[PDB]
From a paper:
The interaction of membrane-bound active RAS with RAF is the first step in the activation of this pathway. Active RAS recruits RAF to the membrane where RAF dimerizes and becomes active. The N-terminal CR1 region contains the RAS-binding domain (RBD) and the cysteine-rich domain (CRD), the CR2 region contains a 14-3-3 recognition site, whereas the C-terminal CR3 region includes the kinase domain and a second binding site for 14-3-3 proteins. Here, we present crystal structures of wild-type and oncogenic mutants of KRAS in complex with the RBD and CRD of RAF1.
In addition, we expressed and purified RAF1(RBD) (residues 52–131). Measurement of binding affinities by surface plasmon resonance (SPR) showed high-affinity interaction (KD ~ 356 nM) between KRAS and RAF1(RBD). The presence of CRD in the RAF1(RBDCRD) resulted in a more than two-fold increase in the binding affinity with KRAS (KD ~ 152 nM) suggesting that CRD also plays a role in KRAS-RBDCRD interaction. To understand what impact the presence of CRD may have on the KRAS-RBD interaction, we solved the structure of KRAS in complex with RAF1(RBD) and compared it with the KRAS-RBDCRD structure. Structural superposition of KRAS-RAF1(RBD) (hereinafter referred to as KRAS-RBD) with KRAS-RBDCRD using KRAS residues shows no significant differences at the KRAS-RBD interaction interface in the two structures. However, RBD residues that are located away from the KRAS-RBD interface show significant conformational changes. Structural analysis shows that the RBD domain in the KRAS-RBDCRD structure undergoes a rotation of 9.3° and a displacement of 0.9 Å compared to that of the KRAS-RBD structure. This observation suggests that the KRAS-RBD complex is likely to be flexible in the absence of CRD, and this rotation of RBD may be needed to properly orient CRD to stabilize the KRAS-RBDCRD interaction. Most of these interactions are observed in both KRAS-RBD and KRAS-RBDRCD structures. The crystal structure of KRAS in complex with RBDCRD of RAF1 described here shows how the structure of tandem domains RBD and CRD form one structural entity, and how this entity interacts with KRAS. This structure reveals that the KRAS-RBD binding interface is similar to that of HRAS-RBD and Rap1-RBD structures, as well as KRAS-RBD in the absence of CRD.
Residue numbers in the entry:
A (entry chain B): 55 to 131
B (entry chain A): 0 to 167
The structure:
């Protein structure tokens, strides 16, 4: 329904459900923790729809509801 | 891991595919029901003396997302076919999942293990004889599991790895 696709380190992938009041940190915490990933060790980017601009580095406090329908990349810092 | 194995977990919604996978990866039981759209994991594990890199492709049980499931299945080498011991339709639909595997893999010769999950529950309704007869009918192993207690979790995944090795 209201989901975000997230490419993760070590060739992994997830699609996460967004609930009201979730930060990006909250929304990805379970997916990261199950995979032994600490959010403090990672950068997160919003991937764009065109190749002209730079993928947008996101703050962990970004509201997850503002990212519904997007694709993100989580990378090791 | 030196040797990499691509394992796909399939079966009806709610049978415990993700809970089984998370028990394998992190030794934790998820009691919430967060339906999967797509989720992949990597885990290094020693199996029969070989350091193995497992790619676990955990698929959606909801047929609405079967297109995504099929993309994961096409990359997989072996399949955990999961039903729940309190859901007879999920057991009957193992045939559907096996047919999907045959269709996507274009082959009738694909490593597969039958998993009957949620064995910790009371009032089980799919009995051992039904389950073993179904596994026998396909010539595949049957493993009883509980993602809640962890019973059978390693056996299910390790048996599938052994089936892939046999097939190689
Ligand atoms: N008692 C018990 N509950 C279990 C077991 N395995 C899963 N569950 C519960 O069953 C529900 C569904 O589990 P889940 O792993 O999400 O199932 P799924 O097959 O991945 N569902 P989907 O196809 O939608 O992704 C959850 O509430 C989970 O806690 C088990 O072995 N025992
Ligand atoms: Cl190891
Ligand atoms: Cl889809
Ligand atoms: Cl047999
Ligand atoms: Mg799931």
């Amino acid at each position: 329904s209201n989901t975000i696709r997230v490419f993760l380190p070590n060739k992994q992938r997830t699609v996460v459900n967004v609930r009201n009041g979730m930060s990006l940190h909250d929304c990805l915490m379970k997916a990261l923790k199950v995979r032994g990933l600490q959010p403090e060790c990672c950068a997160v980017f919003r991937l764009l729809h065109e190749h002209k601009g730079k993928k947008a580095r996101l703050d962990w406090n970004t509201d997850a509801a503002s990212l519904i329908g997007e694709e993100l990349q989580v990378d090791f810092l | 891991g030196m040797t990499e194995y691509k394992l796909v977990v399939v079966g009806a919604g709610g049978v415990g595919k993700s809970a089984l996978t998370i028990q394998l990866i992190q030794n934790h039981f998820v009691d919430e029901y967060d339906p999967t759209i797509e989720d992949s994991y990597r885990k290094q594990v020693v199996i029969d003396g070989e350091t193995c890199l497992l790619d676990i492709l955990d698929t959606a049980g909801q047929e609405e997302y079967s297109a995504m499931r099929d993309q994961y299945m096409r990359t997989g080498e072996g399949f955990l076919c999961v039903f729940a011991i309190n859901n007879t339709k999920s057991f009957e639909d193992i045939h559907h999942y096996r047919e999907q595997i045959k269709r996507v893999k274009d082959s009738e010769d694909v490593p597969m293990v039958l998993v009957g999950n949620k064995c910790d529950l009371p009032s089980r309704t799919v009995d051992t004889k039904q389950a073993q007869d179904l596994a026998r009918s396909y010539g595949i192993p049957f493993i009883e599991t509980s993602a809640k207690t962890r019973q059978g979790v390693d056996d299910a995944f390790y048996t599938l790895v052994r089936e892939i090795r046999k097939h190689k």
